């Protein structure tokens, strides 16, 4: 009786939200951006190839200096690369080799990683002893660790396969806030540039916008037909793009609270593993299962170019903070640095 | 390069030397994925042979790395394992269909199209008692078991009841029939009849892995 009545009210509320989104859908992003000129053909060459990983690369993250990057592979090795010289700055042996994510702290003093061991390990890069050591092991998730991102040297956000995201206090080792509401495994998260909000994508084909300080879900974005694997904030923080197994990328707007544009092609039938934006946000770069990385025009939903330099799945990619280059990681154990030429 | 850059490069080349040392250990160690159910008894088999409960054992100067877990997302990590050790309990007839559906997902998985499955039908000693007692009938769960006859190629152990052999091979046929449905020779199932207290379980994985490795080499030489 009461349960049946309540679940009917939820359907009414869902229709109310859908009508509200339809009310403000006066125009389409495609119509708005029809007049603007196309970006042309985007040609990028492999400037560097980082070799040394002996297994599938699953994650990489640039440092804020746009020169050092950390990559994680399931050979149990975290490696920090000097991208200008391809020098290996550090080689961090992981206690658990099943790593799925890695993050570089904005200060550059710490790196984080974690995977099927359900632990987010924090590594101190600046010690008087001259070696990288574990500073914290963040326990508390009941599923595999899928993504992690530093807010500062003391705070980190982790998303797990136990359908929850958590905000952690690194100094005390306890999670101050737990973010619940996803009904599937959360696969990715992205921090807003001001680090006051973050979006997470799960396998329930939905993206939720969370307030870090308040600790609740502000908005929920649906529209995907399969699991979301990747998510990335727009550089101004007012939008984000997702990538799912349905071979589509969607651009959601926070303030309009709905999808604005879909990035799909008839030839593309494989899942998407990673997404990122260029510094100006005009380019949306997505990694695919078909061994390729397609660069999309974010405004016009046109495939601007292709980065074809890997012999296995493109598992991760990222664009530097200064926008100079993009790195792509792959299951073939190589990292490549890409940029264009005049 | 300046004076410090050359020293930095020297640091980089010593890291590469350490990565090479760890590479040789990586290839010489075989990675095995262990899958099954709660009552499958897989935890007993791995313990006897000695989140992710990893066990390393060495047989005939060959290192085996077996990851016991206990899934559409975290199964992509085990894409390059040599073999998947799938364990079921043949005694429980009620959950066999659940195991068959579970086995179908593993075999037909998109990321497991080139991984051979070393299937284990655990607790054969318990299965014999259940068939010998006759209290539970397999035909209740599997109607096609009534029209099933033991093939002449069957090789039962000495002192084995022919009724058990007819029931034992029917369970295997259901799993094998799923294996031959698709795959086209990319991966091969290797069913076995093991028990918890069996001390030969290590070698059954060893011989099957040797055949799995051998079949990988023969595809390279034949340019398949």
């Amino acid at each position, epitope marked *: 009786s009461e349960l049946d009545q309540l679940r009917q009210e939820a359907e009414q509320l869902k229709n109310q939200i859908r009508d509200a989104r339809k009310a403000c859908a006066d125009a389409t992003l495609s119509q708005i951006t029809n007049n603007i000129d196309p970006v042309g053909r985007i040609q990028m060459r492999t400037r560097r190839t980082l070799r040394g990983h002996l297994a599938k690369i699953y994650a990489m993250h640039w440092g804020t200096d746009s*020169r*050092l990057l950390v990559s994680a592979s399931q050979d149990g090795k975290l490696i920090i690369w*000097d991208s200008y*010289t391809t*020098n290996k*700055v*550090h080689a961090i042996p992981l206690r658990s080799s099943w790593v799925m994510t890695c993050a570089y702290a904005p200060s*550059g003093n710490y790196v984080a990683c974690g995977g099927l061991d359900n632990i987010c390990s924090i590594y101190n890069l*600046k010690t*008087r*002893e*001259g*070696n990288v050591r574990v500073s914290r092991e963040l326990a508390g998730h009941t599923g595999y660790l899928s993504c992690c991102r530093f807010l500062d040297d003391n705070q980190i956000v982790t998303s797990s396969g136990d359908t929850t995201c958590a905000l952690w206090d690194i100094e005390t080792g306890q999670q101050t806030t737990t973010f619940t509401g996803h009904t599937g495994d959360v696969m990715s998260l992205s921090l807003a540039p001001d680090t006051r909000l973050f979006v997470s994508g799960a396998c329930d084909a939905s993206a939720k916008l969370w307030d870090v300080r308040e600790g609740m879900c502000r908005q929920t974005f649906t529209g995907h037909e399969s699991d979301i694997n990747a998510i990335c904030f727009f550089p101004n923080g007012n939008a984000f793009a997702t990538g799912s197994d349905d071979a589509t990328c969607r651009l959601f707007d926070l303030r309009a609270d709905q999808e604005l544009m879909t990035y799909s092609h008839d030839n593309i039938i494989c899942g998407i593993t990673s997404v990122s934006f260029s510094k100006s946000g005009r380019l949306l770069l997505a990694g695919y299962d078909d061994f390729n990385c397609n660069v999309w025009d974010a405004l016009k939903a046109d495939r601007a170019g292709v980065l074809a330099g890997h012999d296995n799945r493109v598992s991760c990619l990222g664009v530097t903070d200064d926008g100079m280059a993009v790195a792509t990681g792959s299951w073939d154990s190589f990292l490549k640095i890409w940029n264009g030429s005049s | 390069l*300046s*004076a*410090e*850059d*050359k*020293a*930095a490069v*020297e*640091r980089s080349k*010593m890291i590469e030397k350490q990565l090479q040392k760890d590479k040789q250990v990586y290839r010489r160690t075989l990675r095995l994925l262990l899958l099954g159910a709660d009552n499958s008894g897989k935890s007993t088999i791995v313990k006897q042979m000695r989140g992710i409960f990893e066990t390393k054992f060495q047989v005939d100067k060959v290192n085996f790395h077996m990851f016991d877990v206990g899934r559409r997302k975290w199964i992509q990590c085990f894409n390059d394992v040599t073999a998947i050790i799938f364990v079921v309990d043949s005694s429980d007839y009620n959950r066999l269909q659940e195991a068959l559906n579970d086995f179908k997902s593993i075999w037909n998985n998109r990321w497991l199209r080139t991984i051979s499955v070393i299937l284990f039908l655990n607790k054969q000693d318990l299965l014999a008692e259940k068939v010998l007692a006759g209290k539970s009938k397999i035909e209740d769960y599997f109607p096609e078991f009534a029209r099933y006859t033991t093939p002449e190629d069957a090789t039962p152990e000495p002192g084995e009841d022919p009724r058990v052999t007819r029931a034992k091979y029917f369970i295997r046929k259901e799993f094998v029939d799923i294996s031959t449905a698709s795959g086209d020779g990319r991966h091969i199932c290797y069913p076995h009849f093991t028990c918890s207290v069996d001390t030969e379980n290590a070698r059954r994985i060893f011989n099957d892995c040797k055949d799995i490795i051998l079949q990988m080499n023969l595809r390279e030489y034949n340019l398949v």
Partner: single-chain antibody
Framework: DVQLVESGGGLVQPGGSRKLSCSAS????????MHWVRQAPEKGLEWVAY????????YYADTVKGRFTISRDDPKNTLFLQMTSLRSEDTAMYYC??????????????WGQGTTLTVSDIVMTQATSSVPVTPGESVSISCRSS???????????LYWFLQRPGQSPQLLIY???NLASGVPDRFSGSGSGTAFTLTISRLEAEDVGVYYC?????????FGAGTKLEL
């Protein structure tokens, strides 16, 4: 904590041989390159030898090349310096210095206490030998180099050290602008090309000492004469 203790020094006859040892504790010794730096009594610092991590690269100063041998024992965390044909010019305090080299590292960050031995090229110039100072007042120290220390990669390989009376040198500024860990922010290094300035705002009693500028552009590493601050 990071420690570097030298031993084996003492009074030796001219033309003799002596073996100096440097025991390291509290840090990953095998990951660090090691230098020997000596300082003659009432004189400045003089670089002696360098052995890299992994023992692959070894450099010597010309004044000691062929007579001194530098070696390390990574399992025992001991640094060695075998000396032969000792002259009266070798009478000095010998310092054991650690230095690690990767992008963003701070070489020469820790020095040992030193051992005393008694026997019976880019030019770095510090023209101002002494500077009278008062507490709380800003002081600037100038250093000059015969060659431009700015490399094509953007680094300017100029190091600033401070040797308080009775103490071992401490790193203040590495690569001409960066401030070493544990050093107060009042120290600031500014330079361009061949001319460099070390500015010390709000001088204190602890800052009193001799300041050395060192170049790390190429071997042999050379030190300036040194500028002494006195009250």
């Amino acid at each position: 904590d990071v420690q570097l203790v030298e031993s084996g020094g003492g009074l030796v006859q001219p033309g003799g041989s002596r073996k100096l040892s440097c025991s390291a504790s509290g840090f990953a010794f095998s990951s660090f390159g090691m230098h020997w730096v000596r300082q003659a009594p009432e004189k400045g610092l003089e670089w002696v030898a360098y052995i890299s991590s992994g023992s692959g690269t070894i450099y010597y100063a010309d004044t000691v090349k062929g007579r001194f041998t530098i070696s390390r024992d990574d399992p025992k965390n001991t640094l060695f310096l075998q000396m032969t044909s000792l002259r009266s010019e070798d009478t000095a305090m010998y310092y054991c210095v650690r230095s690690i080299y990767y992008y963003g590292s701070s070489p020469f960050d820790f020095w040992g206490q030193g051992t005393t031995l008694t026997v019976s090229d880019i030019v770095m110039t510090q023209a101002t030998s002494s500077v009278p100072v008062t507490p709380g007042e800003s002081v600037s120290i100038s250093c000059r180099s015969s060659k431009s220390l700015l490399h094509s990669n953007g680094n300017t390989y100029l190091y600033w050290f401070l040797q308080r009376p009775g103490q071992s040198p401490q790193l203040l500024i590495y690569r001409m602008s960066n401030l070493a860990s544990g050093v107060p922010d009042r120290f600031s290094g500014s330079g361009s090309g061949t001319a460099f300035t070390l500015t010390i705002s709000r001088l204190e009693a602890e800052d009193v000492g001799v300041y050395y500028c060192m170049q790390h552009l190429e071997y042999p590493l050379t030190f300036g004469a040194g500028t002494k601050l006195e009250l």
